[PDB]
């Protein structure tokens, strides 16, 4: 067993396909997802050709170890995939049809910039390294790229599974390597973030602004500091579900900005009280009266600016 | 070793049965559960037939590798199941009786809409792919579908384990595939949610309403904001036990609605105080007096509406 | 290799023994524990007889694959146990002595009703399924059931490891199955729950009752609501260490009841204040004075009632 | 392949050594640690000797399966160790030198009594069970017990790795078993506990005592209850890092005692207020004045008493 | 199969190369990271040479078991690496080119002193132990050390992957061992720590200082104690992401210092109130007036001092 030799001096073309059976565990923090799929491989091995009329049979079967099979590997996996050879068929002209069912944990970076209203392109990169007697090159048989209808990935919507047809061919340690890019396009179901995080977070913020209709320092200090604490909780909660990025994320920005609002609210609450103690309630009164409008307005303007920058 | 050929031109029928020995780890978040069971397979392989008389035994035993065994696989598993062949028996006319004990982690979506008063239908999908010389088709031998009496699944009640007798047959990459649907019907034991989450959550809400019998702004602000914080804790707790759904869940809705109650309570507490400072306690007095009735009543009406929509 | 045939028409008796070397990870939530032990099997196989004289050796040693070994399996495990055959001895008469060292994760329900003052009976169920040529039946060789002295199971006291000598024999999918029940009796070391949970929880409750010696509504509201929150924390803590049961647990009940005390305390604090504002401190005074006695007394009575119901 | 027979009637001595390459994951809760090391075995097998002069080779090599190797196993591991045979050398007189590299997860109880100022003795117990034709006995070749210089175990200081030279020999299920005790002496680096837990915990306690310089009930109640809550947080934090012991631990005791201080502080705060409302500020005044001294003094005395009892 | 013998009496040189394909899971707490890479080995084995001419081949291929392959192992791994031999080539003069793809979990200490503005040098140590017939020595073929462009390690920037060319040779249990040090230089992306932890932590501290512009003891006590609690939360959060070090870390120091500020603020708040009650507001007034400047100034000075000591 060793590679089938060139008729002329052409590279060996291995036709590939991936057909997703299952998708699970898209782990945002680790930036990985698990996949369970059929991997199909096809290539011409002439040493294996036979006659259809005299052979009586129109297709022949083989056990993995009996014939040469190209070593296809995934680039971005954690560990070598788990594979069960399902079937190997050889037709008269010596065309081999290989089919395996595999499962793997795939590494694939996510762009958290628009979280939780983001979309991602997961990748599964197939690769093959040329042997000494000949160069192996990959291709996509579109007929065999797909996914079953039930493939659901919790908390995500699956848009499409397609392969970039043209391999990237390059040299790696003095041998040719042929690599294919299968893409799984998904978008996050942001729905639940609304009632679980966003609204509660806004509610507590608005509750903080009631201090602008109160002349009680002690009350205000309680309103503002208490809610600020609840905000910290949401901040901590949100940040435990994301990995640490070197860029601001949309939610990250809103969350951060909101601290600025609490800080300024505290200042206002402080100033108002100070003026009152210093026997000048009228300045205090008009600073608070202004704040009742400024706060919601600037909060609204700042958010529009952010949504614009981010979307 | 290769498939037994047709007497006429019929498909090969593989009779299947699953018999649950253990059920554990129904993981709500991941939407998976673990199973440990017997898988039984039966089919006719004539090349194995024999005369009871000349051979002096009514049954014949084999080791897996010695005979053709159909490749049955589960659709919705994470990894290829863990299997020990328990026994392979062949009777005179060449009927094979295969028995394996396996364990697997099964993917199966849950409908969280009525959590925690929900019921689910877990599925185990058996599948087989036709080979080139013939089509394989699955069937359920009801005699061999079951579960032992001790099979308990923590925090769930097991209603039934049955198979949909008629396989779904379809083409997948130009070969016929025969798939069976075994169903495990369970319902969640909602009992503990009552004292651990529901009642405590109601208690803190009712405590908030005592603010309606208090003319102390500072006190009220403390009652309302404090309890609101405890509510956030229950909210966070509850949401860490569920996955993120693109639909409102029953508990989710109650939890969310309750925030609305805290927000409105804060407004009332604010308005009441404001009016009092502005030297009009009588309007304040009657807004509070109304609230004592409105709050509980609207809370009760809103809940009836929800239970109706959800159940 | 296939079962040894009957002298008369008796079943084949396999003598078993389990000798615990290690016990760890009793996981309350998952209801499992890990075990590491010797499994010993003995049975007559006459086909293996030999003459010490004509073979030089008093005992023969065999390698697993060389002889028939009965397929013993555990019922309540997650995955097929991890086994290393330690030794296989055959005495001339053909008695086989088999010794393996295994490790497994065992499923075994716990009764949380008296937590954390509970005791449990863990089970390890050995099983064997009869083959076609003969029935296999299990037995306990008490001489070989035990555990080493150092076997410690963190946070539990080990009472005893014994086997129920009489197998349960029954039919399962048309073959006889012989099952043995090994029992590991343990009791939880409740000690630490005292300083870590119980006492702190009582301290915070008693602290709340100081509100009964205070005429300050604002103070009281703080005492009662604050401690109520700390109670919620202990409640959450406790419930993260237990699985969800369809029955009230002892701690669960105490924890729940205590909420009732906080709720009633809030009412009292509310009533007292209300009356005071309404210019009737004398009724208030005597409601508070009553509460100072009622609360501790009813708390004590209710606890005695519970301990009685639970123990 | 079977044991080498006695020249006289002596037991077979297997010389052992463990050389630590890596130490990691000392998990306090689970009471385990992971080890990666060389295991060396040596024994005389005469059937394997040869001529030094005639052969021209000073030593000779074998593959594991070609010769008898004694079955050495670890007592206190979770699963059978992971082993790669590195090399097997046989010298002229038939002395075999075996060397493997293994990794294992070792169970070994810790004494938490002085946490976090504790020291531990981890154990790795080698064992061998005698065969029928002869008794195997273990010994330590000190020349081959050691650890490399870089072996660092996070958050612990490594004192020494030594073996108790004399095996413990005993009968277990009617065969002799020879067991060796390798000891790894470590001591916890308590440093970080100081700024992360101990000091913060003291700071919050001292902050509570400022209530003794305040005549404001409402303020005090806030100081004392707030800090008590922060104490609960540290308590919870600390207890999540330790397993549950049936004995008080040093930190456990300090933590517990401190609750007593909060409880008594609350009483004092209550009494002081009560007396003040009852128009007797002078008794109140002298109870508070006493408390300013009593609290710190009794806290200091109690701690000295504890350190004495524990150290 | 056994080592190729010396032409003269030279050691056998094994040329090595590591080419990173993937980097993930740098786990700060455990001090490990996962790697997926090509490992290339090359050495001269004369027994394998051939004449290019009477063979009609430039190179020859082999299966692992057919030829001698040096046992290269990693020092600092948890478990023996997962390896797939990709290809083995032998050129005419008997030079072997071996290529495997492996994945492993590597142990490698981190210096947390400047967290989160730290840089680290991860190591992968290749090793080989000499056999009896000859000494094996490692070397780096720089041509084959590298990493692919996409190698991203979440939350870290990858600076470089180089090997220290000169092996460290030493004796270990009476055999020579040759060890190589591959270094992966990374630096932490500190960006997110700014908005998620640092700033929030400063905001709450500054909010505490508003107490210096308030004459309300009750208010102040709330401001100072509340924020102190939020600080504890950030402290706990931060410390759950780091392992426990025997040295102060930069963040650790800032965090600790800040407690000192809260403690002193509480004292000031206490003193101010005390003086006020004692009818001397003017001393109080000037202590508070001083604090408004002292606090921020000393906080700023202390930070400059720390950054200096740490950076």
Bridge partners for D90 per DSSP: D60, D96
Alpha carbon of B216 to those of A219, D4, D278, E219, E223: distances in Å?
10, 92, 23, 16, 20
The reply to whether B193-311 shares the fold of B1-192 is no
Which of B61, B191, B219 is facing C218, going by the closest CB pair? B219
CA triple C299-C301-C303, angle to 5 deg: 70
Number of residues written out for chain C: 311
Distance from CA of B57 to the nearest CA of A (A): 33
Of D130, D149, D160, D118, the residue nearest D31 (C-alpha): D118
Residues 127-146 in E contacting D (C-alpha not used; CB under 8 Å): 129, 131-133
Distance from first CA to last CA of chain A, Å, rounded?
56
> Among C107, C132, C243, whose Cβ lies nearest the Cβ of B61?
C132
CB-CB neighbors (< 8 A) of C255 in chain B: 195
- In A30-89, the residues whose Cβ lies within 8 Å of chain E are 30-32, 71, 73, 75-80
Q: Are D62 and D90 in contact (CB under 8 A)?
A: yes
B266: left (phi over 0), alpha (psi -120 to 50) or beta: alpha
E153's torsion region: left (phi>0), alpha (psi -120 to 50) or beta?
beta
Q: Residue C139 corresponds to which tokens in the numbers above?
A: 């037995």
The rounded distance, in Å, linking the Cα atoms of B65 and C90 is: 29
Which residue of C58, C86, C200 is in closest CB contact with D129?
A: C86
Closest CA to C209 of D277, B224, D270, D273: D270
In chain C, positions 225-284, which contact chain D (CB-CB < 8 Å)? Answer: 226-227, 229-230, 233-234, 237
Residues from chain E that touch A270, judged by Cβ atoms under 8 A, are 210, 213-214
Contact (CB<8Å) E154/A218: no
| DSSP structure string for B54-96 | HHT-S-EE--GGGS----EEESSBSS--EEEEEEEEE-TT-EE
Token digits of residue C105 = 């994760």
Token pair 């304040």 is found at B284
Query: Can you tell me the distance from the alpha carbon of C228 to that of B136, in angstroms, rounded to the nearest whole number?
Result: 65
Q: Does D199 touch chain E (CB under 8 A)?
A: yes
Round to whole Å and give the CA distance between C150 and C22.
8
The closest CB to that of E273, out of D152, D200, D214, belongs to D214
Q: Do C103 and D79 touch (CB under 8 A)?
A: yes
Answer yes or no: do E230 and A226 touch at CB < 8 A: no
Please give the structure tokens belonging to residue D240: 């999540």
Contact B154 C76 (CB under 8 A): no
Q: How far is CA B156 from CA B28, C287, D117, in A?
A: 12, 46, 45
Give domain limits for chain B: 1-192, 193-311
The reply to whether residue A244 touches residue E59, judged by beta carbons under 8 angstroms, is no
Question: How far is it, in rounded angstroms, from Cα D56 to Cα D49?
Answer: 14
Closest CA to D16 of D65, D73, D87: D73
- What class does CATH assign to E193-311? mainly alpha
* Number of helical (H) and strand (E) elements in chain B, helices listed first: 6, 11
Q: Which of A131, A225, A248 sits opposite E87 (nearest CB)?
A: A131
Tell me which residue in D82, D195, D214 faces E256 most closely, judged by beta carbons.
Answer: D195
- The structure was resolved to a resolution in Å of 3.2
Q: Report the Cα–Cα distance between both ends of chain C, in Å, rounded.
A: 56
Q: Which residues contact B193 (CB under 8 A, 6 or more apart)?
A: B116, C244
A246: nearest Cα among E196, E23, E242, E111: E196
Cα B227 to Cα A64, A197, B258, C222: the distances in Å are: 66, 18, 11, 11
d(CA B12, CA A123): 39
DSSP string, chain C: ---PPPSSSPPEEEEEEEEEEEEEEEETTTTEEEEEEEEEEEEE-GGG---HHHHS-SSEE--GGGS----EEESSBSS--EEEEEEEEEETTTEEEEEEEEEEEEE----GGGTTS-EEEEEEEEEEE--SS--EEEEE-GGG-EE-TT--BTTEEEEEEEEEEEEEEEESSSSEEEEEEEEEEEEE--TTHIIIIIHHHHHHHHHHHGGGG---HHHHHHHHHHHHHHHHHHHHHHHHSS---SS--HHHHHHHHHHHHHHHHHHHHHHHHHHHHTT-HHHHHHHHHHHHHHHHHHHHHHHHHHHHHH-
Are C129 and C71 in contact by the 8 Å Cβ rule? The answer is: yes
The three-state secondary structure class of D185 is strand
Q: Which residues of E touch D214 (CB under 8 A)?
A: 217, 270, 273-274
Rounded Cα distance between D297 and D254, Å, is 15
The SS3 assignment for E100 reads: strand
- Report the Cα D208 to chain-centroid distance in Å: 36
Before C116, cis peptide (omega within 30)?
A: yes
The two tokens of residue E198 are 């640092």
Two structure tokens written together for C258: 């205590």
φ and ψ at B146, to 5 degrees? Answer: 180, -165
> How many angstroms separate the CA atoms of E96 and E67, rounded?
10
H-helix or E-strand spanning residue B44: strand B32-44
Pairing of strands B119-129, B176-188: antiparallel
Looking at domain C1-192, its CATH architecture is Distorted Sandwich (2.70)
Contact D216 E273 (CB under 8 A): yes
- Alpha-carbon span A127 to E38, nearest angstrom: 14
| Beta partners for residue B188, in sequence order | B156
Contact state of C262 with B203 under an 8 Å Cβ cutoff: yes
Distances in Å between the alpha carbon of D185 and those of A246, D114, D121, D123, D159?
42, 15, 5, 9, 5
Cα separation, E2 vs D181, in Å, equals 36
Q: Tokens for E148?
A: 């692919």
Q: Please name the member of C78, C221, C259 whose beta carbon is closest to the beta carbon of B219.
A: C221
Q: Write the CB contacts of B285 (distance below 8 Å, at least 6 apart in sequence).
A: none
Q: Does B213 touch chain C (CB under 8 A)?
A: yes
Q: Which residue is it, tokens 């401690």?
A: C227
Whether the CB-CB separation of E94 and E47 falls below 8 Å is answered with yes
User: In this structure, what is the dihedral angle of CA atoms B47, B52, B58, B62, given to the nearest 10 degrees?
Assistant: -30
- Contact residues for C104 (Cβ-Cβ < 8 A; gap 6+): C34, C35, C74, C77, C78, C79, C81, C82
- Report yes or no: E114 and E128 within 8 Å, Cβ to Cβ: no
Interface membership of B123 toward C (CB under 8 Å): no
Q: What is the spatial distance between Cα B21 and Cα B147, in angstroms, rounded to a whole number?
A: 6
Q: Is residue E181 classed as helix, strand or coil in its secondary structure?
A: strand
Q: Can you give the C-alpha Rg of chain C in angstroms?
A: 31
Please check whether residue B83 is in contact with residue B98, taking contact to mean a CB–CB distance below 8 angstroms.
Answer: no
Contacts of B59 in chain C (CB under 8 A): 132-133
Q: Which of D61, D152, D195 sits opposite E109 (nearest CB)?
A: D152
Q: Which residues of A touch E199 (CB under 8 A)?
A: 256, 259
Which tokens belong to B2? 């290769």
Are C38 and D173 within 8 A, CB to CB?
yes
- What is residue B116's DSSP assignment? T
Give first-to-last CA distance, chain E, whole Å.
56
Q: In chain E, whose CA is at the least distance from the CA of A239?
A: E196
Q: Where are the beta strands (DSSP E) in B141-281?
A: 146-147, 156-171, 176-188
CA distance C284 to chain B (A): 15
For residue D246, give the chain C residue with the closest CA: C191
Q: Which of D3, D121, D246 to mutate to test the interface with C (most CBs of C within 10 A)?
A: D246
Tokens of C179: 């099952």
Q: Which experiment gave this structure?
A: X-ray
Q: How far apart, in whole angstroms, are the C-alpha atoms of residue C274 and residue C299?
A: 25
D chain contacts of residue C191, beta-carbon cutoff 8 Å: 245-247
- Chains contacting B (3+ CB pairs below 8 angstroms): A, C
**CA angle, corner E264, sides to E259 and E266, nearest 5?**
95
Q: Compute the C-alpha angle B18/B21/B24, nearest 5°.
A: 110
* Ordered DSSP codes for C96-121: EEEEEEEEEEEE----GGGTTS-EEE
Structure tokens of B223? 């009652």
> How many cross-chain Cβ pairs, C to D, lie less than 8 Å apart?
131
Question: Tokens representing D170?
Answer: 């005993």
CA–CA separation, D261 and D247 (whole Å): 22
| Cβ contacts of C80 on chain D, cutoff 8 Å | none
Residues of E with CB below 8 A from A131's CB? 61, 87
Alpha-carbon distance of E32 to E122, in angstroms, equals 9
How far apart are the C-alpha atoms of B95 and B45, rounded to whole Å? 6
Determine whether the interchain pair D213/E270 forms a contact, defined as Cβ–Cβ distance below 8 Å: yes
E61 closest CB neighbour out of A2, A173, A244: A2
Pairing of strands D32-44, D95-107: antiparallel
What residue has token string 């073979």? C55
For B272, counting Cβ atoms within 10 Å of its Cβ (0-12 exposed, 13-18 middle, 19+ buried), the class is buried
Rounded to a whole number, what is the distance in Å from the CA of D112 to chain E's nearest CA? 17
């Amino acid at each position: 067993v060793s590679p089938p030799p060139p008729i002329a001096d052409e590279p060996l073309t291995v036709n590939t396909g991936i057909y997703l059976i299952e998708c699970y565990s898209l782990d945002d923090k680790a930036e990985t997802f698990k996949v369970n799929a059929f991997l199909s491989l096809s290539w011409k091995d002439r040493r294996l050709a036979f006659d259809p009329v005299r052979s009586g049979v129109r297709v022949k079967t083989y056990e993995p170890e009996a014939i040469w099979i190209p070593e296809i590997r995934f680039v971005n996996v954690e560990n070598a995939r788990d594979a069960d050879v399902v079937d190997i068929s050889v037709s008269p002209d010596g065309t081999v049809q290989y089919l395996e069912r595999f499962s793997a944990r795939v590494l694939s970076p996510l762009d958290f910039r628009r979280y939780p209203f983001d979309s991602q392109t997961l990748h599964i990169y197939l690769i093959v390294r040329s042997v000494d007697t000949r160069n192996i090159v990959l291709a996509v048989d579109l007929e065999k790229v797909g996914k079953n209808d039930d493939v659901f990935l919790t908390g995500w919507d699956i848009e499409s599974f397609t392969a970039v047809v043209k391999p990237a061919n390059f040299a790696l340690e003095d041998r040719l390597e042929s690599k294919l890019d299968y893409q799984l396009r998904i978008s996050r179901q942001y729905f639940s973030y609304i009632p679980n995080i966003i609204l509660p977070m806004l509610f507590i913020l608005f509750i903080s602004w009631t201090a602008f209709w109160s002349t009680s320092y002690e009350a205000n200090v309680t309103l503002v500091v208490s809610t600020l604490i609840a905000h910290i909780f949401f901040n901590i909660l949100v940040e435990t579900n994301l990995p640490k990025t070197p860029y601001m994320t949309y939610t990250g920005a809103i969350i951060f900005m909101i601290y600025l609002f609490y800080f300024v609210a505290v200042i206002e609450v402080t100033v108002q009280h100070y003026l009152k103690v210093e026997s000048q309630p009228a300045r205090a009164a008009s600073i608070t009266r202004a704040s009742r409008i400024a706060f919601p307005v600037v909060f609204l303007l700042a958010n529009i600016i952010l949504a614009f920058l981010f979307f």
